[PDB]
């Protein structure tokens, strides 16, 4: 899997070249990490990066006891249905 760095200065996880990332926002006193946008340019498609970036962020929230809101569409309509085992990290009021 490609190295995904945590770039806090920007609240995103990103590939090391900065070119693909998922952005978020922390809600409720740090406890909720909301995923707002996953971005992979067309020339980086086909490398599985969006999903790799969503794993980084889900792992990071699981490791830190955060609940995720799956606000980006890539996440809620592609990531979560394909990776159900991550569903329990979703905050319980989303769905
Ligand atoms: Br990369
Ligand atoms: Br890279
Ligand atoms: Br934030
Ligand atoms: Br917060
Ligand atoms: Br609370
Ligand atoms: Br925070
Ligand atoms: Br891909
Ligand atoms: Br992708
Ligand atoms: Br995926
Ligand atoms: Br799964
Ligand atoms: Br399911």
Short mmCIF file of C-alpha atoms and ligand atoms in Angstrom, two decimals:
data_model
loop_
_atom_site.label_atom_id
_atom_site.label_comp_id
_atom_site.label_asym_id
_atom_site.label_seq_id
_atom_site.Cartn_x
_atom_site.Cartn_y
_atom_site.Cartn_z
CA UNK A 1 0.00 0.00 0.00
CA UNK A 2 1.34 3.53 -0.95
CA UNK A 3 2.61 5.64 2.00
CA UNK A 4 -0.09 7.91 3.33
CA UNK A 5 0.98 10.77 5.42
CA UNK A 6 -0.97 12.77 7.92
CA UNK A 7 -0.83 16.29 7.16
CA UNK A 8 -2.54 18.09 10.14
CA UNK A 9 -1.61 21.55 8.83
CA UNK A 10 -3.98 20.78 6.28
CA UNK A 11 -6.55 18.19 8.33
CA UNK A 12 -5.98 15.81 5.45
CA UNK A 13 -4.40 12.50 4.83
CA UNK A 14 -2.39 12.57 1.67
CA UNK A 15 0.08 10.61 -0.44
CA UNK A 16 3.54 11.72 0.21
CA UNK A 17 3.63 13.78 -3.04
CA UNK A 18 0.66 15.66 -1.74
CA UNK A 19 -1.31 14.94 -4.92
CA UNK A 20 -4.09 12.67 -3.55
CA UNK A 21 -5.75 13.25 -0.22
CA UNK A 22 -8.86 13.04 1.86
CA UNK A 23 -9.83 16.08 3.79
CA UNK A 24 -11.82 16.18 7.02
CA UNK A 25 -12.89 18.35 10.01
CA UNK A 26 -12.93 17.43 13.63
CA UNK A 27 -16.46 17.97 15.35
CA UNK A 28 -17.67 17.44 19.08
CA UNK A 29 -14.51 18.09 21.03
CA UNK A 30 -12.26 16.03 18.91
CA UNK A 31 -14.49 13.00 18.96
CA UNK A 32 -15.88 13.06 15.47
CA UNK A 33 -13.80 13.12 12.39
CA UNK A 34 -16.04 14.27 9.52
CA UNK A 35 -14.67 13.08 5.90
CA UNK A 36 -15.64 15.76 3.57
CA UNK A 37 -13.71 15.18 0.37
CA UNK A 38 -11.51 12.49 -1.09
CA UNK A 39 -9.49 13.69 -4.07
CA UNK A 40 -7.47 11.75 -6.51
CA UNK A 41 -6.55 13.53 -9.85
CA UNK A 42 -7.43 11.62 -12.98
CA UNK A 43 -3.74 10.86 -13.80
CA UNK A 44 -3.54 8.99 -10.43
CA UNK A 45 -6.66 6.96 -10.90
CA UNK A 46 -6.53 3.24 -11.01
CA UNK A 47 -4.11 2.95 -8.21
CA UNK A 48 -6.61 2.49 -5.59
CA UNK A 49 -5.68 5.72 -3.82
CA UNK A 50 -9.08 6.88 -2.70
CA UNK A 51 -9.66 3.66 -0.85
CA UNK A 52 -6.01 3.72 0.49
CA UNK A 53 -6.68 7.26 1.70
CA UNK A 54 -9.95 6.19 3.30
CA UNK A 55 -8.19 3.36 5.10
CA UNK A 56 -5.66 5.77 6.46
CA UNK A 57 -8.34 7.98 7.84
CA UNK A 58 -10.48 5.17 9.20
CA UNK A 59 -7.45 3.56 10.91
CA UNK A 60 -6.40 6.86 12.32
CA UNK A 61 -10.00 7.42 13.75
CA UNK A 62 -10.20 3.78 15.06
CA UNK A 63 -6.92 4.12 16.69
CA UNK A 64 -7.86 7.36 18.40
CA UNK A 65 -11.59 6.44 19.33
CA UNK A 66 -13.09 8.97 16.85
CA UNK A 67 -16.43 8.43 15.05
CA UNK A 68 -16.59 9.16 11.53
CA UNK A 69 -19.11 11.02 9.53
CA UNK A 70 -18.92 9.84 5.95
CA UNK A 71 -19.80 13.24 4.35
CA UNK A 72 -17.75 12.70 1.04
CA UNK A 73 -19.61 10.82 -1.43
CA UNK A 74 -16.71 8.52 -2.21
CA UNK A 75 -16.55 7.33 1.26
CA UNK A 76 -20.38 6.81 1.96
CA UNK A 77 -21.28 5.43 -1.53
CA UNK A 78 -18.17 3.51 -2.41
CA UNK A 79 -15.90 2.94 0.53
CA UNK A 80 -18.34 1.91 3.27
CA UNK A 81 -20.56 -0.41 1.21
CA UNK A 82 -17.48 -2.25 -0.12
CA UNK A 83 -15.84 -2.35 3.34
CA UNK A 84 -18.57 -3.01 5.75
CA UNK A 85 -16.41 -4.02 8.58
CA UNK A 86 -15.62 -0.29 8.97
CA UNK A 87 -19.23 0.57 9.45
CA UNK A 88 -19.08 0.47 13.17
CA UNK A 89 -16.75 3.41 13.24
CA UNK A 90 -19.46 5.60 11.71
CA UNK A 91 -21.13 7.80 14.30
CA UNK A 92 -24.24 6.20 15.21
CA UNK A 93 -26.73 8.88 14.05
CA UNK A 94 -25.69 9.24 10.41
CA UNK A 95 -27.56 5.95 9.32
BR1 LIG B 1 1.31 7.99 -4.62
BR1 LIG B 2 3.40 10.14 -3.43
BR1 LIG B 3 -10.72 20.62 12.04
BR1 LIG B 4 -13.53 19.56 17.43
BR1 LIG B 5 -20.71 14.22 23.42
BR1 LIG B 6 -8.90 17.94 17.34
BR1 LIG B 7 -8.37 3.35 -8.40
BR1 LIG B 8 -8.76 6.26 -6.93
BR1 LIG B 9 -13.09 1.32 -1.82
BR1 LIG B 10 -14.74 -5.32 4.82
BR1 LIG B 11 -22.96 -4.32 4.74
#
